[PDB]
């Protein structure tokens, strides 16, 4: 029940998802300890099927719906 997230400055984290958490709730701590603020970043779902595309997600997305997906957080 985890999600791997690639972060800016070549960083990465694998977070645990507890049912009920929004995407913002599960990445909160990982962003805070790196001094990253979600309001200044966009979060994407990595599309492996379409060689290199990312599809932007809302920070309020239900996190359990994304188990198994690899994500990317970028600055706006």
């Amino acid at each position: 029940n985890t999600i791997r997230v690639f972060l800016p400055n070549k960083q990465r984290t694998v977070v645990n998802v507890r049912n009920g958490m929004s995407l913002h709730d599960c990445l909160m701590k990982a962003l805070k300890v790196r001094g990253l603020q979600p309001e200044c970043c966009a979060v994407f779902r990595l599309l492996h099927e379409h060689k290199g595309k990312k599809a932007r997600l809302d920070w309020n997305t239900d996190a359990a719906s994304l188990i198994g997906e690899e994500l990317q957080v970028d600055f706006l």
């Binding site: 985890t2 791997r4 400055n9 070549k10 960083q11 990465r12 984290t13 694998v14 977070v15 645990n16 701590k29 990982a30 805070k32 300890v33 790196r34 001094g35």
Partner: protein, 167 residues
């Protein structure tokens, strides 16, 4: 600026993450939240030089350890951390040091033995000379006792590794 790849190793609950986030963010993590996979990067200044530090924080408690060999292959400097309040964590380190030498294939690899939770003196079960005597056997490698909570020798762990790599 120059990049330095460091890996923090050790058994579970010894403070690997607490030392790391205290170093990069100045935050003390009081909760025990087992690591799965985490890497940090921070531009620092070591000896009048601006440099990029990559810090791979490893899981002290994981089921599959096949990747450890790869983390050791790509890392330039290693911090082996144990807790002075738990004997088993100190005992577990010899295997990690042997595994690193095996992967790098040299006895001369930047390394520092760290005895964390030095602020819990009354709960100490690993003596300081006991720690120093292990480091001397490991070819006189760097050794220090730290505390992520009291901020004792936290920056020193990482700068020392940068310094050994520069030699």
């Amino acid at each position: 600026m120059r990049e330095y790849k460091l890996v923090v190793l050790g058994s579970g609950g010894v403070g690997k993450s607490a030392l790391t986030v205290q170093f990069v963010q100045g935050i003390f993590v009081d909760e025990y939240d087992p690591t799965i996979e985490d890497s940090y990067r921070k531009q620092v200044e070591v000896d009048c030089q601006q440099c990029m530090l990559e810090i791979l924080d490893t899981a002290g408690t994981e089921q599959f350890t096949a990747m450890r060999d790869l983390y050791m292959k790509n890392g330039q400097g290693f911090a082996l951390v144990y807790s002075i309040t738990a004997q088993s964590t100190f005992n577990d380190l010899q295997d990690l040091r042997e595994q690193i030498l095996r992967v790098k294939d040299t006895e001369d690899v930047p390394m520092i033995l760290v005895g964390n939770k030095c602020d819990l003196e009354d709960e100490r079960v690993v003596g300081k000379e006991q720690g120093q005597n292990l480091a001397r056997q490991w070819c006189n490698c760097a050794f220090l006792e730290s505390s992520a909570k009291s901020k004792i020798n936290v920056n020193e762990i990482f700068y020392d590794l940068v310094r050994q790599i520069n030699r």
